[PDB]
Amino acid sequence: MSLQHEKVTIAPLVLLSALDHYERTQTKENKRCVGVILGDANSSTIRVTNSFALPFEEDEKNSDVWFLDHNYIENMNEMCKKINAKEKLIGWYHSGPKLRASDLKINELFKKYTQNNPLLLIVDVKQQGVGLPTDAYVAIEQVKDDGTSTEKTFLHLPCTIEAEEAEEIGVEHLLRDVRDQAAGGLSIRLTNQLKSLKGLQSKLKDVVEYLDKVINKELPINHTILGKLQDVFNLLPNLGTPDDDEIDVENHDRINISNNLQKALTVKTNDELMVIYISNLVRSIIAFDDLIENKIQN
Amino acid sequence: ALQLFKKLKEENDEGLSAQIAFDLVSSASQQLLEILVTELTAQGYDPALLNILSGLPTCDYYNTFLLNNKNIDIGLLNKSKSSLDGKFSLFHTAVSVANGFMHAGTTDNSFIKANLPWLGKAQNWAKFTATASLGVIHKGNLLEGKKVMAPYLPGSRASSRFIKGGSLYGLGLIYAGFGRDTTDYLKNIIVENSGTSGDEDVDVLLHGASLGIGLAAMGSANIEVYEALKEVLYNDSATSGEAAALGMGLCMLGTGKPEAIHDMFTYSQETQHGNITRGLAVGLALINYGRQELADDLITKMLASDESLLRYGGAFTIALAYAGTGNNSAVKRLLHVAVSDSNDDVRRAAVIALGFVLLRDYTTVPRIVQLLSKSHNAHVRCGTAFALGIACAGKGLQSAIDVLDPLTKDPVDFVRQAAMIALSMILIQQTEKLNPQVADINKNFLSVITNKHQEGLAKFGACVAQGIMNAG
Amino acid sequence: TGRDDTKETVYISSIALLKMLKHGRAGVPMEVMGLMLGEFVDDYTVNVVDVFAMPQSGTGVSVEAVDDVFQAKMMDMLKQTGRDQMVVGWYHSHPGFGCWLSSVDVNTQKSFEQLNSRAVAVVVDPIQSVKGKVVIDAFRLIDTGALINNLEPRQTTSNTGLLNKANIQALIHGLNRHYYSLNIDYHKTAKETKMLMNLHKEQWQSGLKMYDYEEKEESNLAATKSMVKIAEQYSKRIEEEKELTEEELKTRYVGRQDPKKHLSETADETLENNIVSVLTAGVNSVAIK
Amino acid sequence: QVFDERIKFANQLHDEYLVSMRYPEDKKTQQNEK
């Protein structure tokens, strides 16, 4: 259906709902909770506004065996539209941990109800790391050059977060932290430069051990991954370019302004140097007279 | 200790041995005295020695003293009633406490009878407070204790459940320190209702029982009591859980049993009733009294737990463990924690702590806590006031008085209450002749009570504080 | 005879607040409503679990607009998911008016007292949610009977006494002669707190992302120029300004909007930044190649 | 290279300035004064 799924912006309310509902439907230990996600589409940017739980019973043994009460979904839906009839069914949340190729079948069910391709928004509830606990995937059927007679598949989609005005003010009222994703003062940003290096390193390391497995442990040759790595090597920086010379001109500019400004603060504080010393001279006389006053008092 | 007496048995004479006994019992902790009598009994000392050590003498003497030399300015009684109307619940509360302090140690039904109409306006937990204020007055005279509370003790009152409970609580106030026999009487009712406490009638009685038994069994560490209070705690009663939590750390005082700390610590996690959980936090504190470094594991853990609840008690566990040690660790923790903690209840609490730690050394205190009174954080200032009081209660250090004066007049209502209290706590019964300022602070109270442009909050503190000054 | 009757602190869950703001904001300025579902524990701890909204009626908040067919059926959808809990009160939004309970709202609340007599009425004011403030207040009826016999002190027993006294006149009169206003505290788990707190994937990556260089050029030039103009004021100031009478000195030599200080703040902000700027360029070059 | 030395030199003048200024006040404030 809708091909339009270029970006996914996600309401923090959705997250919050997915985390809470997980426990009040009382599912634990890899027992999946599937619920509906409501919001707008037929739009480039997809905006997931809100969500609601459905009952979901999943058989322990296999992921091909499961119970879902279809009829419930239609009954819930019509009351919900009365509240807000903008919202439409656009797909389903899956309560993590992590993608399955059994989902492909699951997705298809939801497609009956929906007039757009259902979005599979894996809201991971385990919150591993401080990085976003959303991967988004959409079921797409595409042809592939290998020989495969049409493959059916889940393609990763960029996940970001946006909140409404009403929503945003709720986020800030709740929080009481000092914060450090502020990237504000010299201190936060000092950290932030180091943090980014190591951020990169961890990712880079994962790429590196993954490449070993491809040509040694018979993980498939996924041509897409390799294909993408070429742009990284081609658009890698170079030295002895007249760009490098250009950076040096800029470097001189910024250090230059730094020194004029450094001297300029020295002047301001020194004016204060004088002001504290006037005060101090004055108070020598006051201290002297103070004694004479006390003599009378005694 | 016992060896001191075998030396003195070979020199035995009444005056000598008795002077040493009087010296010993004032200083000595209850646990020291208790183990010591058993040892003398097998040594077969004169019963004269043991009798002193019972402290039945010392209590007879102090009754006579206060009886004769108590001067009662009567104008206070008549005035509190008039100026602060007793229909309002808060106001009765303040008036009741001031009186119970004024009339300490010696019996007086002089207040009751004169102020029969005031008494009538008490209702709800205001009346519970009233019933218990009586047992501050009738503290001492241990003999006529049971007797004089006998109309109000259960099964002779049925009017109201608030009286029944609070007559039991106050019974314990009388009997701390003599309270071993008294422990039985209170235990009977706790075991009956050891389960059912989800009856609203039952609960109120039982609050008063549970505090009573804490007070009477203080520091004895009757494991019989700790268990009985525990079942109550589990039933998860609205208000008597609070009393239980406290009542257990009162009983077991200072034992620091590994079992005890643990069991309560687990229970805090489960509980949702905001009171119990706080109560257990403070309850952990009470049991780790003077436990120094054996409490460090607990101290790390509470501070480490995000809960508002557990950090509040975190502060007073450090405080009671290191009470009266300048230990550098204890001081650094309390300052760092108070300033940087976001939550208000927890913030006030770490400031209060400092007074306990610095009971021993009152010299460096106006200066450390100068810094905090400067902080124009609302909560922080309230707790500086309280802190000063604890630390310098006994002495008159001038620096302390001065630090407290800007706080008296601070626009935030809640500061003003603490502050006014904190001055009289410092200057407890110090002649106005010696120091003329005392008289001025006192009048200030009276003036605020006159003022109607004040909140009930200033009025509450101000009256109580005059009762602190004029005590017994 | 009965309980302490201290009005409950309404402990509002993180979800219930988020939905409430969202709900009101959509409906503004038309009044919005719904029921609060929760559970009642302790004496004064009401945990407001979650809320749902009832379809906007052309009668606004009314007993008429509490529609039992909708209500019931909703209980039942939530029942299957096992998220059902007792109704513990009701909220609605007045944006038109401050926070208080209108005569119509008092009747509505009276029906709820039969369910649970500790039920709350919560007024959400979503027009002023555009500030950093969340303007929300919670109320619980007082009986007329209580006020006539002057038995009202029972309800205000053993408490810290901090009461919101904002909003007076007719509103306050009504409040005093009908409901009791008490505090709202927000309790939230640290699990909830963390999910919310977490931001983008690109958040922890941004330090090697850098500003376009045409803007750094622009900024360097602007700061050098601006300080020059305030420096004129500062030179004029310390020509004199060593006499007496404080306030007069400030008017004579333009010591109001003080130049020394405004200069010291700008100079430093720009200085710190320029350290960050270089720091990123050097690092980028060297790390990658 | 050139500017770097100048920047470092300013900083030393700041610390000398800061240091000297505060010291007499301390003595004065403690002492009784009207």
Residue C158: exposure state from Cβ atoms within 10 A (0-12, 13-18, ≥19): middle
Same-domain check for residues C176 and C228? no
CB within 8 Å of B243: residues ≥ 6 apart: B206, B207, B208, B210, B211, B214, B279
Q: Are B153 and B168 in contact (CB under 8 A)?
A: yes
CB within 8 Å of B409: residues ≥ 6 apart: B416
Phi and psi of C38, rounded to 5°?
A: -170, -165
B183/C262 Cα distance (integer angstroms): 72
Rounded to a whole number of angstroms, the distance from the CA of C178 to the nearest CA of chain B is 19
Question: Chain C contact for A128, CB < 8 A?
Answer: no
Same-domain check for residues C14 and C89? yes
**In terms of residue numbers, what domain contains C115?**
7-186
Residue B57, classed as helix, strand or coil, is: helix
Residues of A in contact with C269 (CB under 8 A): none
B114/C217 Cα distance (integer angstroms): 86
Same-domain check for residues C140 and C64? yes
Q: What is the dihedral of CA B220, B224, B230, B231, to 10 degrees?
A: -160
- How far are the Cα atoms of B326, B381, C121, C239 from residue B397, in angstroms, in the given order? 19, 20, 53, 50
Q: Do C195 and A15 touch (CB under 8 A)?
A: yes
Residues of C in contact with B200 (CB under 8 A): 2-3
Question: Chain A contact for C193, CB < 8 A?
Answer: yes
Residue C32 DSSP code? E
Question: Chain A contact for D21, CB < 8 A?
Answer: yes
Rounded to a whole number of angstroms, the distance from the CA of B364 to the nearest CA of chain C is 32
Q: Are C181 and C164 in contact (CB under 8 A)?
A: yes
- How far are the Cα atoms of A41, B51, B311, B327, B407 from residue B334, in angstroms, in the given order? 55, 44, 11, 12, 21
Residues of D in contact with A265 (CB under 8 A): 14
Cα dihedral B11, B12, B16, B20 sign: positive
Cα dihedral B386, B388, B393, B397 sign: negative
Rounded to a whole number of angstroms, the distance from the CA of A213 to the nearest CA of chain D is 48
Rounded to a whole number of angstroms, the distance from the CA of C173 to the nearest CA of chain B is 19
Structure resolution, Å: 4.5
Binding residue numbers of C for Zn(2+): 92, 94, 105
- Apex CA C265: angle with CA C264 and CA C270, to 5°? 100
B33/B27 Cα distance (integer angstroms): 10
Residues of D in contact with A256 (CB under 8 A): 3
Same-domain check for residues C15 and C65? yes
Buried (b) or exposed (e) across A37-74, using 16+ Cβ within 10 A? bbbebeeeebbbbbbbbbbbebeeeeeeeeeeeeeebe
Nearest to C43 by CA among B193, B311, B275, A167: B275
Residue C94 DSSP code? -
Q: Do B273 and C42 touch (CB under 8 A)?
A: yes
Q: Are B422 and B430 in contact (CB under 8 A)?
A: no
Residues of D in contact with A273 (CB under 8 A): 17, 20-21
- Does the bond joining A97 to the residue before it have cis omega, within 30 degrees of 0? yes
Same-domain check for residues C173 and C233? no
Question: Chain A contact for D8, CB < 8 A?
Answer: no
Give the Cβ contact number of residue B234 at 10 Å: 16
Q: Do D25 and A258 touch (CB under 8 A)?
A: no
CB within 8 Å of A111: residues ≥ 6 apart: A1, A117, A118, A139
Look at residues C171, C186, C201 and tell me which one is the last residue of a structural domain: C186
C194, part of any domain: no
C86/B404 Cα distance (integer angstroms): 51
Rounded to a whole number of angstroms, the distance from the CA of D2 to the nearest CA of chain A is 10
CA atoms within 13 A on the CB side of A259: 15
Q: Are A125 and A22 in contact (CB under 8 A)?
A: yes
β-sheet bridge partners, residue A53: A35
Technique used by the depositors: cryo-EM
C55, part of any domain: yes
C56, part of any domain: yes
Nearest to C199 by CA among A200, A12, A95: A12
Same-domain check for residues C182 and C219? no
Q: Which one of C42, C47, C190 has the shortest CB-CB distance to B238?
A: C42
Nearest to C86 by CA among C54, C121, C47: C47
Give the Cβ contact number of residue B21 at 10 Å: 19
Could you identify the residue written with the tokens 């009314």?
C62
Q: Compute the 3-state secondary structure of chain B and give helix, strand, coil in percent, each to the nearest 5.
A: 70, 0, 30
C110, part of any domain: yes
Residue count (chain D): 34
A287/A232 Cα distance (integer angstroms): 74
Q: Are B273 and B236 in contact (CB under 8 A)?
A: yes
β-sheet bridge partners, residue C141: C179
Q: Are A262 and C275 in contact (CB under 8 A)?
A: no
Q: Which two tokens stand for residue B289?
A: 């009294």
- Apex CA B401: angle with CA B399 and CA B404, to 5°? 110
Q: Do D20 and A293 touch (CB under 8 A)?
A: no
For residue A18, the one-letter residue type is A
Same-domain check for residues C251 and C155? no
Q: Which two tokens stand for residue C235?
A: 């030179």
Q: Are C210 and C281 in contact (CB under 8 A)?
A: yes
Cα dihedral A76, A78, A83, A84 sign: positive
Could you identify the residue written with the tokens 């945003």?
A168
Question: Which A positions 65-104 lie with beta carbon below 8 A of chain C?
Answer: 69, 72, 75-76, 79, 82-84
Question: Chain A contact for C286, CB < 8 A?
Answer: no
- How far are the Cα atoms of B52, B385, B389 from residue B352, in angstroms, in the given order? 37, 8, 9
Question: Chain C contact for A220, CB < 8 A?
Answer: no
Residue B394: exposure state from Cβ atoms within 10 A (0-12, 13-18, ≥19): exposed
For residue B18, the one-letter residue type is A
Same-domain check for residues C166 and C226? no
C6/A139 Cα distance (integer angstroms): 56
Q: Touching C: which chains, 3+ CB pairs < 8 A?
A: A, B
Give the Cβ contact number of residue A272 at 10 Å: 14
Look at residues C186, C202, C234 and tell me which one is the last residue of a structural domain: C186
C199, part of any domain: no
Could you identify the residue written with the tokens 């058993």?
B38
Q: Are A68 and A56 in contact (CB under 8 A)?
A: yes
B74/B66 Cα distance (integer angstroms): 17
Q: Do C81 and A21 touch (CB under 8 A)?
A: yes
Helix (H) or strand (E) holding B233: helix B223-235
B abuts D (3+ Cβ pairs < 8 Å): no
Q: Give chain C's radius of gyration (CA, Å).
A: 29
Q: Which two tokens stand for residue A237?
A: 């920086």
Query: Which parts of chain C are beta strand (E)?
Result: 9-12, 32-41, 45-53, 87-93, 120-124, 136-141, 179-182, 184-185
Q: Which two tokens stand for residue C111?
A: 């029906």
β-sheet bridge partners, residue C53: C34
- How far are the Cα atoms of B32, B211, B247, B449 from residue B221, in angstroms, in the given order? 14, 15, 11, 44
- How far are the Cα atoms of A12, C33, C100, C191 from residue B306, in angstroms, in the given order? 23, 35, 35, 11
Q: Number of folded domains in chain C?
A: 2
Interface test with A, best of D2, D12, D15, D33 (most A CBs within 10 A): D33
Residues of C in contact with A250 (CB under 8 A): 213, 216, 281
Residue C198, classed as helix, strand or coil, is: coil
Look at residues C168, C186, C204 and tell me which one is the last residue of a structural domain: C186
Ramachandran region, residue B139 (left: φ > 0; alpha: ψ -120 to 50; beta: rest) = beta
For chain A, give the secondary structure using H, E and C.
Answer: CCCCCCEEEECHHHHHHHHHHHHHCCCCCCCCCEEEEEEECCCCEEEEEEEEECCCEECCCCCCCEECCHHHHHHHHHHHHHHCCCCEEEEEEECCCCCCCCHHHHHHHHHHHCCCCCEEEEECCCCCCCCCCEEEEEEEEECCCCCCCCEEEEEEECEEECCCHHHHHHHHHHCCCCCCCCCCCHHHHHHHHHHHHHHHHHHHHHHHHHHHHHCCCCCCCCHHHHHHHHHHHHCCCCCCCHHHHHHHHHHHHHHHHHHHHHHHHHHHHHHHHHHHHHHHHHHHHHHHHHHHHHHHHC
Interface test with C, best of A176, A186, A191 (most C CBs within 10 A): A186
Could you identify the residue written with the tokens 């509470």?
B302
Q: Do A255 and D33 touch (CB under 8 A)?
A: no
Same-domain check for residues C75 and C156? yes
Q: Do C278 and A15 touch (CB under 8 A)?
A: no
Cα dihedral C263, C266, C269, C275 sign: negative
Same-domain check for residues C77 and C38? yes
C196, part of any domain: no
C7/C155 Cα distance (integer angstroms): 7
C52, part of any domain: yes
Sheet holding A151-157, edge to edge: A151-157, A134-142, A119-123, A88-94, A34-40, A45-53, A7-10, A159-161
Q: Are A15 and C192 in contact (CB under 8 A)?
A: no
Q: Touching A: which chains, 3+ CB pairs < 8 A?
A: C, D
A262/C227 Cα distance (integer angstroms): 13
Q: Do A170 and C21 touch (CB under 8 A)?
A: yes
Q: Do D7 and A258 touch (CB under 8 A)?
A: yes
CA atoms within 13 A on the CB side of B131: 30
Rounded to a whole number of angstroms, the distance from the CA of D3 to the nearest CA of chain A is 7
Same-domain check for residues C23 and C122? yes
Rounded to a whole number of angstroms, the distance from the CA of C257 to the nearest CA of chain B is 26
Q: Are B347 and B354 in contact (CB under 8 A)?
A: no
Same-domain check for residues C79 and C174? yes
Cα A280 from chain centroid (whole Å) = 56
C120/C108 Cα distance (integer angstroms): 11
